[PDB]
Structure formats: C-alpha cells, structure tokens
C-alpha cells in the first residue's frame, strides 16, 4: 500500500508485560473464519 | 515553525542529470515520510514520489517510474531526489512535502525550486 | 490512478461573499479527500483534511463536507486573503491533484 501510514510511532507502550495470560488456550474457536469482512 | 528549503534548481541539457535535495527543520524529520509534488505552471499537481520514514519503502508515479530515484539522509536533516534522463516534459515547479501526522497527506511545502530542460 | 475534476474551474466574488467549489472524482472514496489554497508564487498549504476537518491555523469561514463521489467546499464571509487557486486531493490510492479552480474579485 503506497498511501500506508509513513510515520514512526515511538508513543506504543515500551513497558514489559509479564502480567498476560500465561495459561494455553486449547479451546479457542478453531473453526476456520472466511466471513470476516474482508474490505478495508 | 515547519521550515523546508529546496535547491540545485536551474537549467539542464535534455537526457542530462540533475539532484535536488530538501533541508528540513523544525520537525523530527528523522521519524516522519516525505514526499516529492511537482507543479506545472498555469497547470495543476502531480505527485512524483513518496520515501517512508525509515527509507525501506519508496514508490513513484508510472510516468517517472525507473528514472526517479528518491533517497534520504536522516542524519542532516535532508531529503533528496536523483534525477536521471530528464526530459521536455519534465520542467516544472518541484516542491518538497510533509506528510501528516494522523493521515499520509501532506501539509507543509517549501517553496521550491524551477527546474527547466 | 483515480481521476479528479472540479467545477467551476474559475469563480467571481466579491468580499463577504459564499462561495461552494465542487470536487468529483470517480474511484468512490467517502472518507480521504483534501483541500488547498496556492497564492500566486507561493508554496500550497493544507485547508481541510479527512473531508471535514481543518489544519490548525485555517480559520472556521473553511468548511468541508461530502460522500460517496459528491465532495465540496464551504467558504463563507469571503475575506481578501482567500483569493488563491484552492485545488483538490485524494488518498485512499496513489495520489493525483485536480485541474485548479481560482476565485476572482467580481
């Protein structure tokens, strides 16, 4: 994408995160998703 | 306080080479994508070419592409555009640009130069 | 490359006037379109961005709204120093300007 947004961003969050959930997700939906809305 | 400034405008032979460059100031230019809008005069706009912030992306317009080259230089502040092979119908007003901060328009331009084959 | 027109290309007024430019453009967008002012010998300067917002530093008389293929101008309490040639711009592909309207003193 020749228009995608050109610019730096040094304001993301730059803090570790050892608080995320360190548990695995076996249950999530594995259902394959093709009706996503796939415009822009 | 967005200060651009453009030279090494002037008079060139046809399929010659000429290289612009575009001092920048009062912005972080090291962190932010610049363009490159010639103007024909009594004409409107046309855009040439865009560099990312980084210098990894570069794209130009089909009637300038593999002839344009666009090239930065973050460590003194300036912006360059080598130009090979120009022609007739390349003579115009070309001027240096800014791109936004929330969307990839462009909001300052310098004053630039006049470039004549 | 999307395609750009505006009408009328060239407007007379008078100061304190309302003016309307028209801006069409096929390659529906709805969102990214600009506005533009170039004095005569002088570098262009960002009016109205996103459509319907404004740069800072362009006062309020400056408005713009539009959708779809329908994008427009709003100028009102026309002021001396807005005689310029106001062009227009997209985004949402490779960018291309228009033809350029210029204002006149009727």
């Known amino acids: 994408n020749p228009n995608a947004n050109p610019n730096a961003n040094p304001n993301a969050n730059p803090n570790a995160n050892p608080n995320a959930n360190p548990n695995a997700n076996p249950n999530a939906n594995p259902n394959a998703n093709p009706n996503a809305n796939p415009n822009a | 306080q967005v200060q651009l400034v453009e030279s090494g405008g002037g008079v060139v032979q046809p399929g010659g080479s000429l290289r612009l460059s575009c001092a920048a100031s009062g912005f972080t230019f090291s962190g932010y994508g610049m363009h490159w809008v010639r103007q024909v005069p009594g004409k409107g706009l046309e855009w040439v070419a865009i560099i990312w912030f980084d210098g990894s992306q570069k794209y130009y317009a089909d009637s300038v592409q593999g002839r344009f080259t666009i090239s930065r230089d973050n460590s003194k502040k300036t912006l360059f555009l080598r130009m090979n092979s120009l022609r007739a119908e390349d003579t115009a007003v070309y001027y240096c640009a800014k791109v936004h901060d929330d969307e990839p328009t462009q909001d300052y331009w310098g004053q630039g130069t006049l470039v004549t084959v | 490359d999307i395609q750009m027109t505006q009408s009328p290309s060239t407007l007379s007024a008078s100061v304190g006037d309302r003016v309307t430019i028209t801006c069409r453009a096929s390659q529906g967008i709805s969102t990214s379109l600009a506005w533009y002012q170039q004095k005569p010998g002088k570098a262009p300067k960002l009016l109205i961005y996103?459509?319907?917002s404004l740069e800072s530093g362009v006062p309020s008389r400056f408005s713009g709204s539009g959708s779809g293929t329908e994008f427009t101008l709003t100028i009102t309490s026309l002021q001396p120093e807005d005689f310029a040639t106001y062009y227009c711009?997209?985004?949402?592909?490779?960018?291309?300007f228009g033809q350029g309207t210029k204002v006149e003193i009727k």
């Open positions: 996103k459509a319907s």
């Open positions: 711009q997209q985004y949402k592909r490779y960018w291309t």
